[PDB]
């Protein structure tokens, strides 16, 4: 079935990997000291970036689909409980924070009227 | 013998790590934390005192290089810069990392951390701070190293070593 | 106000700048305002280091009030008396505030405390007018008395003493700094102390060099005249390590430096300071004064 | 003692034992010798909120900074956690962050393992003073990314919550724009990188989308004419995802984006492209097959059953945003 | 099965990396634009690949146990999601205006205390 084709393609890409390995091995590896390391590594990095950019620019059956779908529904059903529990926990957390906010708002209110009346009394006295 | 990342072929879902340093007991404990839990891919751990690595025709691919440095001794430093001359520049493209131990205890840090920061920034390599002595810190660094190994080994589709280097890069 | 620019300056404080070179202190006689008897009591004694946040509303006039307040606190904690004195001539600059001494006398001095700041202006540049900046504290006496005095100061001036620590880098730098100093009378051979890191107590290497040999080696590894540079310190340590390894094939470099003693002064990592020669005394303070700032910032 | 014991025609501080006493004597208050007791005494916090005095700022800065240093060095724990919780509670008040905590976190973040007091650390980054996005990244966000790219997915959701709280606090304080734009771009880059990282786990996607909902109301909540668009990778990952609540909150977020856009060049083009994309994807969807099975268990018009199932955001999106079929 | 496909994927990434390395064998703004471009093109490629593959999956599902359990679970849990979402929305709507009023009042109180302190020192 599809598994045999996948195994054959895996062997083919293993052969391609071996070909690339024996192709690349015929290069003197490298040698750097402290002084010239930075420029060399920058050049190597930019060369690799260009190479992989170019490479990426170049780039079944129903039973396996059904099995993978069953797996993903099972995973979703078995991991939603954490996000739900977080949802409640944050709900009561926000409720508590809101209550504290009204408490602080109320206290600072009478703080404001007291400060204003004291300021007015001092202004009238002088 | 200059080590090369592209010498041989790796095993079927196999990953390898290398730890180079002076304190053998700390390396053993760190490897114990490494192998406290095993992921889907099999993991091999190698420990060494200096470079070049001893010759072995049976050496598999070494997909990750980690240098442990103690700020408590300049000897570990001299070891690191002497060993650094036996690896090609290709390892420096995200296959190398530096882990500093004991940095929290500023009193016990013999060499100043600015030196190792400059050393890491010179070679454009990730720099990590941890304390191997503390069990919790060691365990946290354990999953950290396991998962950075998973990223660099190519097990997860989408990123490579140079990608994580562009991720972990410092501003200056 | 001061807080914003202070935030900016400690934001700029990163471990990226190179360590600046330091000017070697020269033979300087004690200043005229400096009393030889007071320093002679201060010198040739052991001192414990403490870093201090700037004093809040500290006046040099009401010293008797401070003395009686400390006496009251001590008797509350419980034939002793507390004496406050003002010491002139040991400020690095005019910006640095006046220094003073506190003594405990059993009616025979048992506990001495010194508050000072030499060449310390960065803290003085980031402080308002109300505060007094003497971040350096030297203690000599029983630990219980030191704790009591610290408790009183915490309650009074809203500050703490922090036990200042010295690492191997700083200790090696200061070792090179005093071995650069010229001493007419070599009365104490230089001596270094190490400690191997091990949970059971292990060997503690003590390495001593004759003053003439030390001075000759220093002048051999001395390049910039009148100045000390990181390369000089590194080559000094490397030469010592190479000599030790040639002797014994033992990498001393893998050991923690814990105490450095020379002819003029001696330092310990825990915060112990011994002073012998006055000729460089003031400069000594200045250097360690920077460490208090480096602990405050 | 972690909190110093308080030691005292100015009103004596000891006599301050009731709220009316503070109301009457706020003008003639005297600053304490030590203000640590101000933290656990809300009475003095009321005067601290408006005193705006330079010397007490430095006095409290040095106090709390050295206290944090000594507690941290002594830790290497429950008392430290409680003290930091009290600090966080005080930080909730004053509607502005402290600087001693900022300096401590700057010093300890590179040394931070990520698990010592993670709960305590992550709530301080929420209250960080507004600054240009050019000095904090080299010192602060680098180690944040270091942890983020390597730590647990739940830790990723954690730091996402911390940064969205920081964004909320910064918008609240401001109510310049380049700094918040760069911050949004940086957090979006982290978002897409991690969304790739975790094999496209919707657990982090929920936090991504919640953060983006908190973002989407800048113009209507703070009168700031600035709207930033989420990366197309998250757009395509979430829009055609397999979870129905994801569809719900995407409908909500594009409705809010359209409302903000009509409230006030390339942004409009990308928005129109996205609208065409989802209108092509919508009127089928695999995520609704569940409902369809229920429709088989129980009617040409079946959208009413979906609506009764609780997709009210879907009514809002399909009635007030698309306008192609305004009637239900 | 799953091990076979994950080995296949890992071999694919290894082969791509080796191809990039062998191709590379032959400033900072240029590099920065490089990761920008590669990120954009890779993001587009994964968008297209995932879209096509699990669109094929969606069609296969359309062509067609614990399925009832899964569907009732998702329905109930998503209803709870939307309830929590509405609660958070209203709570945040309240928080926005209360915090804005608090900040405005804080500014007003700071100004009032400043002016009263200045005048109080003024008669003194």
XYZ file of N, CA and C in Angstrom, chain A residues 65-117:
159
model
N -5.800 9.046 6.370
C -6.437 10.325 6.667
C -7.437 10.178 7.806
N -8.239 9.112 7.771
C -9.232 8.893 8.818
C -8.551 8.647 10.159
N -7.489 7.839 10.167
C -6.788 7.566 11.419
C -6.177 8.837 11.999
N -5.541 9.653 11.153
C -4.958 10.902 11.634
C -6.035 11.851 12.146
N -7.184 11.898 11.467
C -8.277 12.726 11.948
C -8.797 12.278 13.299
N -8.957 10.967 13.481
C -9.379 10.458 14.782
C -8.365 10.830 15.856
N -7.076 10.718 15.527
C -6.036 11.102 16.475
C -6.141 12.577 16.846
N -6.404 13.446 15.867
C -6.409 14.876 16.163
C -7.658 15.278 16.945
N -8.810 14.657 16.651
C -9.972 14.880 17.514
C -9.714 14.395 18.935
N -9.075 13.232 19.090
C -8.769 12.755 20.435
C -7.847 13.728 21.161
N -6.830 14.237 20.462
C -5.906 15.188 21.071
C -6.620 16.470 21.484
N -7.489 16.992 20.617
C -8.210 18.218 20.947
C -9.123 18.008 22.149
N -9.866 16.899 22.159
C -10.765 16.629 23.275
C -9.986 16.409 24.565
N -8.761 15.889 24.459
C -7.995 15.584 25.660
C -7.104 16.743 26.089
N -7.036 17.823 25.308
C -6.258 18.956 25.799
C -7.079 20.225 26.005
N -8.345 20.262 25.574
C -9.137 21.468 25.817
C -9.399 21.731 27.298
N -9.279 20.724 28.163
C -9.647 20.938 29.559
C -8.705 21.930 30.234
N -7.426 21.936 29.846
C -6.498 22.906 30.419
C -6.896 24.330 30.055
N -7.199 24.575 28.776
C -7.543 25.936 28.379
C -8.864 26.355 29.012
N -9.817 25.431 29.152
C -11.039 25.774 29.875
C -10.744 26.156 31.319
N -10.013 25.303 32.041
C -9.712 25.585 33.440
C -9.003 26.925 33.588
N -8.095 27.243 32.661
C -7.518 28.581 32.637
C -8.601 29.633 32.457
N -9.599 29.345 31.616
C -10.658 30.320 31.372
C -11.447 30.621 32.642
N -11.856 29.587 33.384
C -12.504 29.878 34.665
C -11.556 30.642 35.579
N -10.348 30.108 35.789
C -9.422 30.727 36.732
C -9.250 32.215 36.448
N -9.098 32.586 35.173
C -8.992 34.001 34.833
C -10.320 34.723 35.022
N -11.447 34.024 34.861
C -12.734 34.673 35.105
C -12.865 35.121 36.558
N -12.640 34.207 37.505
C -12.694 34.606 38.913
C -11.558 35.559 39.277
N -10.393 35.420 38.636
C -9.315 36.369 38.895
C -9.717 37.783 38.494
N -10.327 37.928 37.317
C -10.772 39.238 36.861
C -11.899 39.767 37.733
N -12.789 38.885 38.195
C -13.844 39.325 39.103
C -13.256 39.884 40.395
N -12.279 39.176 40.968
C -11.637 39.647 42.191
C -10.906 40.963 41.960
N -10.182 41.069 40.844
C -9.465 42.303 40.541
C -10.429 43.463 40.337
N -11.563 43.209 39.683
C -12.574 44.240 39.495
C -13.156 44.696 40.827
N -13.438 43.753 41.730
C -13.940 44.126 43.049
C -12.919 44.974 43.799
N -11.645 44.581 43.736
C -10.593 45.380 44.356
C -10.517 46.766 43.729
N -10.732 46.846 42.416
C -10.710 48.133 41.734
C -11.834 49.036 42.219
N -13.043 48.490 42.380
C -14.122 49.308 42.933
C -13.827 49.711 44.370
N -13.212 48.819 45.149
C -12.831 49.183 46.511
C -11.877 50.373 46.516
N -10.828 50.304 45.697
C -9.864 51.396 45.626
C -10.517 52.672 45.111
N -11.389 52.545 44.107
C -12.089 53.702 43.562
C -12.940 54.373 44.631
N -13.685 53.576 45.398
C -14.500 54.131 46.467
C -13.638 54.853 47.490
N -12.556 54.215 47.943
C -11.710 54.852 48.950
C -11.137 56.173 48.443
N -10.568 56.169 47.234
C -10.001 57.403 46.709
C -11.075 58.457 46.494
N -12.338 58.052 46.328
C -13.393 59.055 46.215
C -13.447 59.938 47.456
N -13.782 59.360 48.617
C -13.815 60.163 49.836
C -12.465 60.813 50.106
N -11.371 60.190 49.654
C -10.082 60.880 49.706
C -10.163 62.203 48.946
N -10.770 62.177 47.755
C -10.857 63.378 46.928
C -11.753 64.436 47.555
N -12.935 64.049 48.041
C -13.783 65.059 48.680
C -13.123 65.633 49.930
N -12.436 64.797 50.715
C -11.742 65.314 51.890
C -10.651 66.301 51.497
N -9.850 65.957 50.485
C -8.792 66.860 50.044
C -9.372 68.166 49.515
N -10.444 68.080 48.725
C -11.044 69.280 48.154
C -11.636 70.175 49.234
N -12.326 69.588 50.216
C -12.927 70.401 51.268
C -11.846 71.017 52.149
